Amino acid sequence: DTCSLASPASVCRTKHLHLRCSVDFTRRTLTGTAALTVQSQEDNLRSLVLDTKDLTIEKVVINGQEVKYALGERQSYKGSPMEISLPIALSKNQEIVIEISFETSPKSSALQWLTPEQTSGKEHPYLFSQCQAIHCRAILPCQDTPSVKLTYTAEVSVPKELVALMSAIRDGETPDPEDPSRKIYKFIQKVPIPCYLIALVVGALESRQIGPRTLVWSEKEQVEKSAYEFSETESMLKIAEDLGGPYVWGQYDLLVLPPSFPYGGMENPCLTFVTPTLLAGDKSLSNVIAHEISHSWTGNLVTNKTWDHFWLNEGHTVYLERHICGRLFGEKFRHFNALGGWGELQNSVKTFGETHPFTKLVVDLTDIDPDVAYSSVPYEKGFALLFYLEQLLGGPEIFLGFLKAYVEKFSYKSITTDDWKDFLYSYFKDKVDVLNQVDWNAWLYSPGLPPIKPNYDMTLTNACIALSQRWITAKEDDLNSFNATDLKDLSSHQLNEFLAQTLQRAPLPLGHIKRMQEVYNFNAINNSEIRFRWLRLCIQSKWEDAIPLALKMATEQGRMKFTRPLFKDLAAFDKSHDQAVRTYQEHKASMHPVTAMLVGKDLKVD
Ligand SMILES: c1ccc(CNc2ccc(OC[C@H]3CCCN3)cc2)cc1
Ligand SMILES: [Yb+3]
Ligand SMILES: [Yb+3]
Ligand SMILES: [Yb+3]
Ligand SMILES: [Zn+2]
């Protein structure tokens, strides 16, 4: 594991974490103890190494006495390794508890601390975590590798008017004995998980039940809207259970975060985290929920052993997601989404360049910050490989049989690409000659678009392409023929695909874009996917009226899918360049630490 400085699982492994901590909003620190139950995998083990990042270590206690530890030099985005001297040498399989008193930095990359004004209610502050990929070390000392799976329990002291939630079953609450202005929330996660799945939020939260095993959680002002948006959740769980086997996590709760949440969603066990940019008013962005649900099998049960193997998580999860959405809304819709995805892959490959190492399916992360490598490639090249295998090997019913067997086989494990490929070949031993037709070396190890494109139903895509083509080939004297009725029979998804089709050919003449606003009134659509793509098209087509709209969307939410390209478009437009860097500089301090880092790199600032 090239992204971790800890002792590998061949040396020792964490089986359990007990976390007791207090969330201090005045200092923006989390302070407490992490008791790691560690099992030796070696004879005569006398030291072990943990990952840390910007932690302050007070002391390390084993068998009731303090022990020697040392922090090595910081290795950039990897943090600093912490070597611990064991008081007694351990034999193979022996376990001990190591209890570490620690405190986080206010500047912890795993965490965003929000002032009251940054929330809906404007009364209370808010804290949230996002550990994936390698930020759990910025919360607590751990072996920060998905190659190790541990259970955990926690007790978290927070100001009594706030609520703590984690990726775990809620285990009760009480006043804090040590300070009656506080409450302690307790948590148990009894299913072994990789440490990137450890998550905390603390805020003025409320919940509403929306299914037999689902509460939606948010600040008071979003609860009603969220409950409606995510009402398909239980029915997606039922379908996911048909496809992946039993749901083993007990609860499936949803947490809708404040707008700065850096991603679409994070599949935290027991409590999925989603962006509020999903709240479109019509459930149209529900594929993200289906995605997060799917991770309860692919990712959370079968986990990538290292981050080089991240496509295992995402490709399988996108593949199950599109199946759930296919069940709900028809096989033509699965194909429409599948084809859209291939279009998103062309975009990423074009952005990075077609010989770029990040466009490889399996990546080598040696010396690479995983946050910098992150993109649509593992999702879409991964999905495209599985969609191609589906078609090669006899269709969706046959391939779903493999997917279910794959989950059973590697449940509670961490695996590599060769483990998966090996199982694939074993499962389809009667179709090995077909599998030997796959260019594996190209699919897995080569940059650029895949060597083969799957076959796609075009039914729902056609009208999108026909309209996109009308606009691109139009001349000035054709602009009059466009009318609000062009969009008549297009769903929100088709408007989005129409915009994506056209964005692929941007810039368009500025007169065309103005006409498009005149006839389609895209400025008035609040759907975040549609508005995102429409504003990108305006900025790339040099429409100055779109500049304050694109500045406003980039900074009013922080979902990096939207905030990173909007800022990048704005800096590439000469008329908005200085404003873009001005805006970033002003917002930087109150941005998500990783978001701030990546936007800065994108803009070449600092
Ligand atoms: C291709 C691209 C990136 C990588 C590893 N980097 C990586 C970086 C961040 C990751 O998680 C961040 C967000 C994504 C949604 C939930 N959390 C996950 C992986 C591996 C292969
Ligand atoms: Yb020994
Ligand atoms: Yb209990
Ligand atoms: Yb084999
Ligand atoms: Zn995912």
Q: What is the resolution of this structure in A?
A: 2.2
The phi, psi pair for 436, rounded to 5°, reads -75, 0
On whether the CB atoms of residues 112 and 260 are closer than 8 A, the answer is yes
Burial code (b: 16+ CB inside 10 Å, e: under 16) for 427-463 equals: bbeeeeeebeebeeeebbebbbbbeeebebeeebbeb
Provide the angle, in degrees to the nearest 10, between the axes of the packed helices 377-392 and 396-410: 120
**Amino acid occupying residue 480:** N
* Spatial CA neighbour of 205 closest among 153, 258, 152, 251: 258
Experimental technique used to determine this entry? X-ray
- Residue 149, beta-bridge partner list: 194
Does residue 269 have its Cβ closer than 6 Å to ligand 1? Answer: no
On whether the CB atoms of residues 224 and 207 are closer than 8 A, the answer is no
Other beta carbons within 10 angstroms of residue 489's beta carbon come to 8
Q: Which member of 69, 319, 379, 584 is catalytic?
A: 379
Other beta carbons within 10 angstroms of residue 568's beta carbon come to 18
d(CA 69, CA 66): 9
Token pair in block for residue 374: 């992150």
Expressed in angstroms and rounded, the spacing between residue 262 Cα and the centre of ligand 1 is 12
> Of the bound ligands, which one is closest to the alpha carbon of residue 321?
5
Task: Identify which of 78, 112, 128, 310 to mutate to test ligand 1's pocket (most ligand atoms within 8 A of the CB).
Answer: 310
Q: Is 219 a catalytic residue?
A: no
d(CA 324, CA 283): 15
Burial class from Cβ neighbours inside 10 Å (0-12, 13-18, 19+) for residue 380 reads buried
Does residue 266 have its Cβ closer than 6 Å to ligand 1? Answer: yes
Q: Which member of 292, 321, 380, 497 is catalytic?
A: 292
Domain coordinates of the chain in residue numbers? 11-203, 204-300, 301-457, 458-606
Task: Identify which of 307, 358, 361 to mutate to test ligand 1's pocket (most ligand atoms within 8 A of the CB).
Answer: 307
Q: Is 292 a catalytic residue?
A: yes
d(CA 212, CA 447): 45
Residue corresponding to tokens 């729902």: 460
Q: 56 to each of 29, 31, 33, 355, 449, how far by Cα in Å?
A: 10, 9, 12, 42, 45
Domain 458-606: state its class. Answer: mainly alpha
* Cis ω before 133 (30° cut-off from 0): yes
Tell whether 325 is in a known binding site.
no
d(CA 518, CA 167): 47
Instruction: Check residue 122 and report its DSSP letter.
Output: S
* Cis ω before 262 (30° cut-off from 0): no
* Annotation: CATH topology of 301-457: Neutral Protease; domain 2 (1.10.390)
Provide the angle, in degrees to the nearest 10, between the axes of the packed helices 492-503 and 528-540: 20
Q: 527 to each of 277, 502, 553, how far by Cα in Å?
A: 8, 18, 12
DSSP state string for 357-370: GGGSSS---TT--H
* Length of the chain measured in residues: 606
Tell me the residues surrounding ligand 3 (ion) with CB < 5 Å: 171
Give, using CA atoms, the residue closest to atom 12 of ligand 1: 132
Other beta carbons within 10 angstroms of residue 293's beta carbon come to 27
Domains 204-300 and 301-457 share a fold: no
The phi, psi pair for 115, rounded to 5°, reads -70, 165
CA within 13 Å, CB half, 92: 4
d(CA 498, CA 14): 49
d(CA 124, CA 203): 7
On whether the CB atoms of residues 387 and 395 are closer than 8 A, the answer is no
Q: What's the CATH superfamily of 11-203? A: tricorn interacting facor f3 domain (2.60.40.1730)
Does residue 378 have its Cβ closer than 6 Å to ligand 1? Answer: yes
Q: 19 to each of 28, 68, 269, 414, how far by Cα in Å?
A: 18, 21, 17, 23
- Per CATH, the number for 204-300 is 3.30.2010.30
How big is the CA angle at 272 (ends 271 and 278), to the nearest 5 degrees?
A: 140
Beta strand extents in 25-105 (DSSP E only):
29-40, 45-52, 55-62, 65-66, 69-71, 80-90, 95-104
